[PDB]
Design a protein around this nucleic acid. Structure first.
Ligand SMILES: [Zn+2]
Lengths: 71, 21, 117, 88, 204, 183, 47, 188, 50, 74
RNA sequence: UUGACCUCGGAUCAGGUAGGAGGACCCGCUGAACUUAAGCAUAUCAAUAAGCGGAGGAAAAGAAACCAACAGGGAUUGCCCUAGUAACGGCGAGUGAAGCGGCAACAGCUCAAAUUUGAAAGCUGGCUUCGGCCCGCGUUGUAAUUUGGAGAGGAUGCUUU
RNA sequence: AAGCUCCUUCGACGAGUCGAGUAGUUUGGGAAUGCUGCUCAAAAUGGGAGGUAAAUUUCUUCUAAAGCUAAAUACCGGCCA
């Protein structure tokens, strides 16, 4: 709290952190999956378009009507 | 890394695969 | 039942949607990394232990060594191609052995392998 | 209960944790000879040579804490006595 | 009077205690060692069979590498190292064993004479882990062994086996199962009559 | 196999040879300092079994701590006290593991195996660069050694429900009141 | 050969050390000054 | 409580369950004991009480239930430790062949020989065994003498109160053929 | 009693005419050293490269 | 007077007999601090002073502890 | 006379490292009382507050000397119910888990015990023209192989970089 | 250099540690729930924990006293938003 007041009172600038993340959120590269991945879609929707299974376990809930990625 | 781990990774590295829907 | 200090030990789940979004973003991080691969590993079918729940099956930890051998999947290759391995479990019954080898055959029939480099 | 077909399982080396090691037994015998005996073992040997075997069992129990440990200690010491008599 | 440094005092006190304490036979046997003539003969043979230095090994490997750029018999050397020598003894490959007398912790070699006697391998106890370690190209060798020698030295090795076993093992068989120590001098014995007359006379 | 012979010999402790060696060695340690550098392991089999290697970086320090009780009983062990004192003296080293060497009636003697995290051999060799990592500072002070694990009760089963996974952590978890959004 | 001279030196130094640490109380020194010697140490002359 | 009431009998601590039951016959030979009273606890809840004669006599196994001990403060009675007790047995103990073998095993154990030097001289308590259900009920009473109105006995319960259901009688010290098996025992 | 009794050799008095290990003998104790073969080949590579 | 100036914390609180600061405990290496006085803890906690170097650390972290000069700089 | 080894020392020797701060959360030690109830005493507050020591971005725990009694499950961690149940308590005040089951996330490994013995094959330095030169540590054991639902050695034939 | 296969050959697994008695402390948990201190002090078809009236201590399940390891977990402090 004292450090925050000191920062708000001093003339030194605020070190604004860019929103960097440890792990990327979309496939990247020059491969088929990277070129066909839609970043505005979800994991299950992308895999349903691809024709691939994303989860090999039991369904933990109701899927979308057109979902074909949760075996 | 150790030599035995190096050998194990050399001869059995993570493969690329996919499961059909 | 408040003889202790629940006020200093009380917790609220106001970040339930935040953690849901975070977990969903983690699953997409895994599928961005393991993009053509499923985001999980194939788990065996196991019968629940006690008399209360022995009428049902669930997913177990990993496949047994001899049921992998019967399926025809080598031990050192199964975790690499995405199959969980459990060296502690014993089949003890042809029923469990057959169910799991059939599951592994289905995985084999639906799997696509890429040739190394 | 339910009828499931039993399967014969392979032998488990963790089950073979039971010690049949001839070399380990050799090492134990040689170290016994080299190191000698504890004073309470000397007492037990003295009683065994004088035939006070019941007293020896009682003293071994008092020193060790269990019937089985006392019995094994007395058997080991009787074997030592027999081997010494054969060697002399 | 004068004040000795603490470490000097402690090591001289250990010398006194080593002489005065009654020691178990497994260490009294190490107190018994061999003599100058047998040491000299054993070290003649073992100096003939000393191993190569690092410089010599590097020179040899360079010689063969140069030859390959521009089919050998089995080498025979003195074996050293406790684990290696104990393995040789249990496998009855060692024909002669030499054990240093000044190993500390002693427990590293206290079983070796008994093990050698059980396996039937001739052994001797030599004064020197530094003598032994300079026989090898190290600072200290706790034990060395001769397993196989060349045909030019088979008879010399057999004669050394006979000499060691008779002129050392007969005397140590006479005195190896008895306790050592108890070398009370004038001061120790006088202190003990003082103790006995201070205790056994009137009160205890 | 010499290490196996020493293992059996050390199991035979009240035997004549071991008793004699322990006596004359207890007198030496009583003549020396309370904490001192030991040039080599007095029990090499125990040291190598607990993880002592003959590299540059592995040090052995011997310590004697007074035995007994405070009728109050100290929850940690004399091993833990000896390890903490040796670590405080060698503040730049990481305490790998300790072992009993001699008992005596008024003291108790432990040799502590320590590793230098800053030595190049330790840094390059795996199996020890984990102790080079900074999460292992003062394991003896945090209870991360064998005696610490034993005293804290890190065993699995019905006899360690309260103490495994941390006693204070388990108590806090059991005494938190959890309130969800839709109650 | 039997270490008699070394033992005598060590014993003399040990006795000096004991006497010094004891003679640091001055109650010990008072006791030592007032303590009379015995005759079973002088035994040996004629009786 | 039973060991205090038994001056000819001595205690023995925990017995390994992995040991064979006839190893109890070689523990008896060590202490020169011809009778054994073995308390075997199952699951830490159920007591099974064995009576035998070593080395070749009959043995009886019972399940012990309904235990109350001398430290319970509802008892009100007390007796001399080592005093020889008057043993009272119900009539069924001289009718059913199985209850007659239990009787001689009870007489040998809870008997306190006549001239034993570790006994007390004056007798003040009665140990009673009764057959009410298919079970043996054991009671212990102090004999209180009170003068008659112009001396007669009152009884005040003093000690252990337990119930024993017979299970097996086997011809042997802790083995041999079974001579009796309850066929009506219900296990906890 | 004897405070310092002599050791009766009840185990070492009997001599065994065989080793302890029945384990099989490896090839490398009869054939030349692959370790020196490796080192010599590294030295050959170094000499060829200068 | 029983309190002169303390060089470490600057308060007129060093006993002249005990030679120990009643505020920070100057002769001891550690700075005196107790959990029953949150006001004292927040009086002498980080941020109440100048922040010589800890104020400069975060920007170097942001740029990744990178060293050198820009390419093409004079 | 000299030289090795062992042990113990000196140096403003060459190169390094620890102390303090912070302590929201974390790992240990230490450790109350106010309060409640009960003829009294244990109990409760609480294995809490205060005090001391030690880390990180998480810590800790962790790959069964586990749970079970079934058709068995299968490292650790957390959520939901189990459950205010079992259990201990003048069977007071009260205290009070866990297995199973649904879920989130999942990942397995390194040594000691074996002789490389046909070859210490291992490693720290500091002098470098950066290529390799020596000082040494180490056989009281540094590499490679192995870690018990294993493994080694031979033979054998495919498949691996 | 590595994986697998077969076998008229082998297969080493942690001690003042378990355990016994005892004192204190702790737990829902005297089969002591765990821990610590003192005394004594182990084993090798071994040891530990359970099941079981089933007729004897049969059966079941694991290997302790050496070590590493991300994730899901916590967060009134740090850089921010
Ligand atoms: Zn100040």
């Amino acid at each position: 709290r004292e450090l925050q007041k000191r920062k708000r009172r001093s003339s030194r600038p605020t070190i604004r952190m860019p929103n960097r993340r440890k792990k990327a959120l979309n496939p990247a590269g020059n491969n088929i999956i990277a070129k066909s991945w839609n970043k505005k879609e979800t994991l299950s929707q992308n895999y349903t378009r691809f024709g691939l299974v994303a989860k090999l376990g039991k369904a933990t809930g109701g899927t979308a009507p057109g979902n074909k990625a949760l075996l | 890394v150790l030599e035995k781990t190096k050998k194990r990774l050399t001869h059995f590295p993570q493969r690329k695969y996919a499961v059909k829907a | 039942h408040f003889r202790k200090h629940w006020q200093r030990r009380v917790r609220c789940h106001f970040d339930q949607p935040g953690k849901k979004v975070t977990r969903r973003l983690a699953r997409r991080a895994k599928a961005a990394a393991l993009a053509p691969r499923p985001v999980d590993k194939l788990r065996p079918i196991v019968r629940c232990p006690t008399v209360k729940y022995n009428r049902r099956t669930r997913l177990g930890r990993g496949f047994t060594l001899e049921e992998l051998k019967a399926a025809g999947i080598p031990r050192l290759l199964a975790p690499t191609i995405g199959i969980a391995v459990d060296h502690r479990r014993k089949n003890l019954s042809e029923e469990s052995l057959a169910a799991n080898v059939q599951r592994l055959k289905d995985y084999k029939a639906r799997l696509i392998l890429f040739p190394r480099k | 209960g339910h009828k499931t077909t039993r399967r014969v399982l392979k032998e488990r080396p963790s089950r073979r944790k039971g010690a049949q090691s001839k070399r380990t037994q050799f090492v134990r015998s040689l170290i016994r000879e080299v190191a000698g005996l504890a004073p309470y073992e000397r007492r037990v040997i003295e009683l065994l040579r004088n035939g006070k075997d019941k007293r020896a069992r009682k003293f071994s129990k008092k020193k060790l804490g269990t019937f089985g440990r006392a019995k094994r200690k007395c058997e080991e010491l009787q074997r030592i006595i027999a081997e010494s008599r054969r060697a002399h | 009077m004068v004040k000795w440094p603490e470490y000097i005092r402690l090591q001289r006190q250990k010398k006194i205690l080593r002489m005065r304490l009654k020691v178990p036979p497994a260490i009294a046997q190490f107190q018994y060692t061999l003599d100058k003539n047998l040491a000299a003969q054993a070290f003649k043979l073992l100096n003939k069979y000393r191993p190569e230095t690092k410089q010599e090994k590097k020179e040899r490997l360079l010689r063969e590498a140069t030859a390959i750029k521009e089919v050998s018999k089995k080498p025979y050397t003195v074996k050293y190292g406790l684990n290696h020598v104990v393995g040789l003894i249990e496998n009855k490959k060692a024909s002669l064993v030499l054990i240093a007398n000044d190993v500390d912790p002693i427990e590293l070699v206290v079983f070796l004479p008994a093990l050698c006697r059980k396996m039937g391998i001739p052994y001797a106890i030599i004064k020197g882990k530094a003598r032994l370690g300079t026989l090898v190209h190290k600072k200290t060798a706790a034990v060395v062994a001769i397993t196989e020698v060349r045909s030019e030295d088979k008879n010399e090795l057999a004669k050394l086996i006979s000499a060691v076993k008779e002129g050392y093992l007969e005397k140590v068989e006479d005195t190896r199962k008895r306790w050592g120590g108890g070398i009370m001098g004038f001061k120790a014995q006088k202190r003990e009559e003082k103790r006995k007359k201070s205790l056994e006379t009137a009160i205890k | 196999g010499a290490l196996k012979y020493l293992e059996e010999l050390s199991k035979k402790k009240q035997s004549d040879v071991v008793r004699f060696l322990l006596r004359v060695r207890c007198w030496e340690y009583r003549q020396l300092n309370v904490i001192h550098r030991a040039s080599r392991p007095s029990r090499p089999d125990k040291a190598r079994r607990l993880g002592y290697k003959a590299k540059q970086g592995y040090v052995i320090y011997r310590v004697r701590v007074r035995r007994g009780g405070r009728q109050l009983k100290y929850q940690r062990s004399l091993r833990a006290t000896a390890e903490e004192r040796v670590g405080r003296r060698c503040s730049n080293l990481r305490v790998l593991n300790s072992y009993w060497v001699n008992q005596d009636s008024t003291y108790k003697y432990y040799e502590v195996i320590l590793v230098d995290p800053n030595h190049k051999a330790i840094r390059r060799d795996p199996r020890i660069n984990w102790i080079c990592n900074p999460v292992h500072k003062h394991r003896e002070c945090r209870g991360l050694t064998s005696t610490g694990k034993k005293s804290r009760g890190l065993n699995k089963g019905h006899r360690f429900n309260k103490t495994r996974a941390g006693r204070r952590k388990t108590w806090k978890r059991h005494n938190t009141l959890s309130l969800w959004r839709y109650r | 050969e039997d270490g008699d001279q070394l033992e005598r030196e060590l014993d003399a130094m040990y006795e000096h050390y004991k006497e010094r640490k004891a003679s640091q109380d001055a109650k010990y020194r008072a006791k030592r000054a007032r303590q009379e010697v015995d005759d079973e140490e002088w035994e040996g002359l004629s009786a | 409580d039973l060991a205090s009431m038994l001056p000819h009998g001595r205690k023995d601590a925990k017995f390994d369950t992995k040991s064979r039951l006839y190893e109890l016959c070689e523990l008896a030979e060590l202490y020169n004991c011809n009778n054994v009273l073995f308390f075997e606890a199952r699951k830490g809840k159920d007591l099974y009480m064995w009576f035998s004669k070593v080395p070749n006599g009959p043995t009886v196994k019972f399940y012990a239930q309904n235990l109350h001990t001398m430290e319970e403060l509802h008892f009100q009675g007390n007796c001399l430790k080592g005093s020889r007790p008057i043993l009272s047995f119900d009539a069924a103990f001289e009718q059913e062949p199985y209850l007659k073998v239990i009787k001689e095993l009870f007489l040998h154990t809870f008997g306190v020989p006549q001239g034993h030097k570790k006994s007390k001289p004056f007798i003040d308590h009665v140990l009673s065994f009764s057959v009410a259900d298919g079970k043996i009920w054991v009671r212990n009473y102090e004999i209180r003498e009170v003068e008659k109105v112009k001396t007669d006995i009152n009884l005040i319960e003093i000690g252990p109160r337990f119930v024993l259901t017979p299970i097996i009688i086997q011809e042997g010290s802790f083995g041999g053929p079974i001579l009796y098996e309850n066929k009506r025992f219900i296990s906890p | 009693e004897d405070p310092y009794p002599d050791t009766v050799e009840w185990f070492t008095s009997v001599e065994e005419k065989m080793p302890l290990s029945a384990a099989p003998e490896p090839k490398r104790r009869f054939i030349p050293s692959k370790n020196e073969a490796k080192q010599i080949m590294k030295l050959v590579r170094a000499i060829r490269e200068g | 007077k029983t309190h002169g100036l303390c060089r470490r914390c600057g308060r007129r609180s060093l006993h002249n007999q005990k030679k120990v600061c009643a505020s920070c405990g100057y002769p001891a290496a550690k700075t005196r601090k107790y959990n029953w006085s949150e006001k004292a803890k927040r009086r002498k906690v980080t941020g109440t002073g100048r922040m010589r170097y800890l104020s400069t650390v975060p920007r170097r972290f942001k740029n990744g502890f990178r060293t050198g000069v820009p390419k093409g700089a004079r």
